[PDB]
C-alpha cells in the first residue's frame, strides 16, 4: 500500500520525482532530445527556400495527390516537406520564392491522410497567399 | 508471529485473578529462600527452580508469597551466573550444529538454520548491552565460545 506516516516526506517527494519521468509529455519537454531534434528551434514559424515541387500520395481508402514542396531553411540549413492548402494554388509558386511555413495543428504529429507532413505554407513573397487566393491582392512581379 | 518461522500458535499460560495465598500452604518465605539457595548451589536455572516448587511443594508464584522475583533474590546474595539463561542456550545450540556441520558439510538445512540462530543472537545482545548487563565490547566470535558453554 501507501507509506502514510507523519515524517515520510522525503520518500514520497522522491518517489514522485523518479516516477514522473514515465509520463510521455513531461519526459518529452524537460529533455532536450525532442527540442534539439525539432527543425524549429522551439518556435512557431520559419522562413526558407524552395528547391523542388513534388506530389505526395495518400493513404489507402482515399486516393489523391497532395501537392507538396521540398524546402530548405535559412538559419539551420535543414530540409523538410510542406503542404499548400487550397484549390489551384501551387501555380502561384515559382522556384526560389522565400516562403513562410508553420505547423499544422498536432504539435509534431502527422495529420490526416498525408504520409509524413507536418508543415504548411502560409506566405509566399510576403503577400499572404490566402488573400491572394481571394483576389484581394496579386503577387509582386 | 514466530519471528523466524510461519506458525501462529497461542499455547501459553493464564495466571488467575486472585493474587492471594490460598491458606492451606503453611510454608513461609524465609523457608522458601532457603530452599532456593540450596537449589542454586547445585547449578539450576530460575525456571528449573520454579517448576520444582510448583510440582512438589505447592508454590504457584514466588512473587506472591515473597514480594520479589527469583533473579533479584539470587543477585541479592551473589549467586546469579555470569551470562543470562536465554543467551546461554542459544550459544550452546549453535556450537552443536557447527560441530555437526564440521563433518557433514553437505547439509543445507543446517546452514540455513544456523544463520537464523546467529541472527537471533545479535538482536538479543543489543538489548542486554543497551540495558547495561554486558560490557560495551562483548561480542560473539564463533571460534571461541565453545568454551563459555561447557
Amino acid at each position: 500500500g501507501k507509506c502514510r506516516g507523519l515524517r515520510t516526506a522525503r520518500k514520497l517527494r522522491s518517489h514522485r520525482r523518479d516516477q514522473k519521468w514515465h509520463d510521455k509529455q513531461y519526459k518529452k519537454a524537460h529533455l532536450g532530445t525532442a527540442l534539439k531534434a525539432n527543425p524549429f528551434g522551439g518556435a512557431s514559424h520559419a522562413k526558407g527556400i524552395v528547391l523542388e515541387k513534388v506530389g505526395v500520395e495518400a493513404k489507402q481508402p482515399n486516393s489523391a495527390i497532395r501537392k507538396c514542396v521540398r524546402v530548405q531553411l535559412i538559419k539551420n540549413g535543414k530540409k523538410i516537406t510542406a503542404f499548400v492548402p487550397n484549390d489551384g494554388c501551387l501555380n502561384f509558386i515559382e522556384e526560389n520564392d522565400e516562403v513562410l511555413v508553420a505547423g499544422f495543428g498536432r504539435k509534431g504529429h502527422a495529420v490526416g491522410d498525408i504520409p509524413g507532413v507536418r508543415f504548411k505554407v502560409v506566405k509566399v513573397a510576403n503577400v499572404s497567399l490566402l488573400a491572394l487566393y481571394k483576389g484581394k491582392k496579386e503577387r509582386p512581379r | 508471529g514466530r519471528m523466524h518461522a510461519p506458525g501462529k500458535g497461542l499455547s501459553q499460560s493464564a495466571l488467575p485473578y486472585r493474587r492471594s495465598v490460598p491458606t492451606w500452604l503453611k510454608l513461609t518465605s524465609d523457608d522458601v529462600k532457603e530452599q532456593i539457595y540450596k537449589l542454586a548451589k547445585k547449578g539450576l536455572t530460575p525456571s528449573q527452580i520454579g517448576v520444582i516448587l510448583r510440582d512438589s511443594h505447592g508454590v504457584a508464584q514466588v512473587r506472591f508469597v515473597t514480594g520479589n522475583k527469583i533473579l533479584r533474590i539470587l543477585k541479592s546474595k551473589g549467586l546469579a551466573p555470569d551470562l543470562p539463561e536465554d543467551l546461554y542456550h542459544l550459544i550452546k545450540k549453535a556450537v552443536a550444529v557447527r560441530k555437526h556441520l564440521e563433518r557433514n558439510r553437505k547439509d543445507k538445512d543446517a546452514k540455513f538454520r544456523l544463520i537464523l540462530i546467529e541472527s537471533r543472537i545479535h538482536r538479543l545482545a543489543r538489548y542486554y548491552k543497551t540495558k547495561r548487563v554486558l560490557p560495551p565490547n562483548w561480542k560473539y566470535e564463533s571460534s571461541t565460545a565453545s568454551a563459555l558453554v561447557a
Binding site: - | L10, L15, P16, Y17, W24, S56
Partner: protein, 83 residues
C-alpha cells in the same frame, strides 16, 4: 444472532472455551493431595506436573509425566479438594 447478553454467559458456556477467550481468563489446573498407601504422609501435587516425584522415603514413585495431565501408580488416591 442480533441479540444476546455477553456479560452473563452460561457457566456451561464460558467453561467450554479457551482459557483466554473467556470473558475473563481462568486457569484450568488444580493441586491435589495424595495418599501413598504404603505410607501415612499426604504430599500435594500439581495436575500437569511434568516431573517425577519420589516419595518421602525415596521408596516409590507417584507421577510419571505426559504431554498433558500426569498419571498415578494405580494404587494411589488423590483428593482434588483445594482452596
Amino acid at each position: 444472532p442480533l441479540a444476546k447478553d455477553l456479560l452473563h454467559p452460561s457457566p456451561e458456556e464460558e467453561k467450554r472455551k479457551h482459557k483466554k477467550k473467556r470473558l475473563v481468563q481462568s486457569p484450568n489446573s488444580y493441586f491435589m493431595d495424595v495418599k501413598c498407601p504404603g505410607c501415612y504422609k499426604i504430599t500435594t501435587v500439581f495436575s500437569h506436573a511434568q516431573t517425577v516425584v519420589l516419595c518421602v522415603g525415596c521408596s516409590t514413585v507417584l507421577c510419571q509425566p505426559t504431554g498433558g495431565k500426569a498419571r498415578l501408580t494405580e494404587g494411589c488416591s488423590f483428593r482434588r479438594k483445594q482452596h
